[PDB]
Amino acid sequence: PIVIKFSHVVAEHTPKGQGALLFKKLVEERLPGKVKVEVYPNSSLFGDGKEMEALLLGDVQIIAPSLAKFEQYTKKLQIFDLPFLFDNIQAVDRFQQSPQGKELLTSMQDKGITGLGYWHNGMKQLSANKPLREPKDARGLKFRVQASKVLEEQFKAVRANPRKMSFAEVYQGLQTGVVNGTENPWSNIYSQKMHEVQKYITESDHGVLDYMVITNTKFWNGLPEDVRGVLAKTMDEVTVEVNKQAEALNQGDKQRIVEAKTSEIIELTPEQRAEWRKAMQPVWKKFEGEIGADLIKAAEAANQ
Ligand SMILES: [Zn+2]
Ligand SMILES: [Zn+2]
Ligand SMILES: [Zn+2]
Ligand SMILES: [Zn+2]
C-alpha cells in the first residue's frame, strides 16, 4: 500500500494530535489495503526545523506546522503571527476561508509544497514565574518563541528578551532558566507539563496558534487520481472535526491545569488587555512591506 507518514511535534491529546489520528482512522477504513497512514507525534520522527527537509526529501508525506514557522519559505504567512490582529477565532476562520486566505495554501508552490487546509488550535496565553498583568511586568524576562521574527518583535516591544526554540525543547528551557516565560494555547501548556514550571498563566488571548496541513506536491499529484480524491475529501472531513473541537479541547486542558494545583491563572480586565495591545500591536508596521499592506487590510476586514 501507499504509505503516508504524518509527522508532528505535539502530544496525542491535542487538536493536531487528534486530527492526525482521525485522518489515519478514516483513510484506513476508506482505502483498505491501498493506503496506510503512520502517525508520529511528539517529534518522534521529525522535530522543529527539520520536518520541512523531510517533507521535500520524501521522508514524510504530511506535516502540519504552526503558521508561525514558514518565514524562510514565504513571507505571507507571517500575517498570522501579528499580535492582536484577529479579534476572535471566527475572524481568523473567516480570513482563512476567504479567497485570499485560500490562495495562501499555495504560497509555497515554488518549493514543491501543497497546502491541504488550515487546522485551528487556539489563541495563545502568556506564562511566566511572575504575574504578567501589565506590559512592564514582562520587562527583562526571557521568553521562548517559535522561530518567527514577528514573535521576536512582539516581545522586544515589551522589553523582554525572546529566544527562538524548537517546541520539544521548551519545557527544559523553562526548567533550566534559559527562558523564564513563553506563550502557548492551553493544550500545549498542559500536554508538555509547562504549568509545572510556570507559576502564573495570563489569559491574554494575544495571538493565533494555528496550522497549515501541507504535503509534497510531487508526491501528492503523483498519487492515483481516485486515491487522491478520497484522501482530499477525507482530509477536509478531518479539518471540520479538528476545528469544531479545538476550543473544547483547550478548555479541557485549562481545567486540567487548574486541577493540577501548580499554577495560578490571571484574568485581565479589558483595560489591562488594552495596555498589552497598545504595547505590541505596533509591531505590524515592521512587516507590512513583506506581508503586503492590502493582505493585512483584508485580515482586518475579517474582524467584521
Ligand atoms: Zn482588533
Ligand atoms: Zn485558530
Ligand atoms: Zn480554538
Ligand atoms: Zn500518476
UniProtKB/Swiss-Prot annotation:
InterPro entries from the UniProt entry: DctP_fam, TRAP_DctP, TRAP_DctP_sf
Gene Ontology CC, one term: outer membrane-bounded periplasmic space
CDD domains the UniProt entry points to: PBP2_TRAP_SBP_like_1
Induction: Expression is maximal in early exponential growth phase and declines with cell density to reach a plateau in the stationary growth phase. Induced by the C(4)-dicarboxylates succinate, fumarate and malate. Positively regulated by RpoN and the DctB/DctD two-component system. Negatively regulated by DctA.
Keywords on record: Periplasm, Signal, Transport
Effect of loss of the gene: The dctA-dctPQM double mutant shows no growth on malate and fumarate and residual growth on succinate.
Compartment(s) of residence: Periplasm
One of the GO BP terms on file: transmembrane transport
Pfam family, one: DctP
Complex and partners: The complex comprises the extracytoplasmic solute receptor protein DctP, and the two transmembrane proteins DctQ and DctM.
UniProt miscellaneous comment: The DctPQM carrier is more efficient than the DctA carrier for the utilization of succinate at micromolar concentrations, whereas DctA is the major transporter at millimolar concentrations.
Protein function: Part of the tripartite ATP-independent periplasmic (TRAP) transport system DctPQM involved in C4-dicarboxylates uptake.
PANTHER family from the UniProt entry: C4-DICARBOXYLATE-BINDING PROTEIN DCTB, PTHR33376
Family label: Belongs to the bacterial solute-binding protein 7 family.
Name of this protein: C4-dicarboxylate-binding periplasmic protein DctP
Organism: Pseudomonas aeruginosa (strain ATCC 15692 / DSM 22644 / CIP 104116 / JCM 14847 / LMG 12228 / 1C / PRS 101 / PAO1)
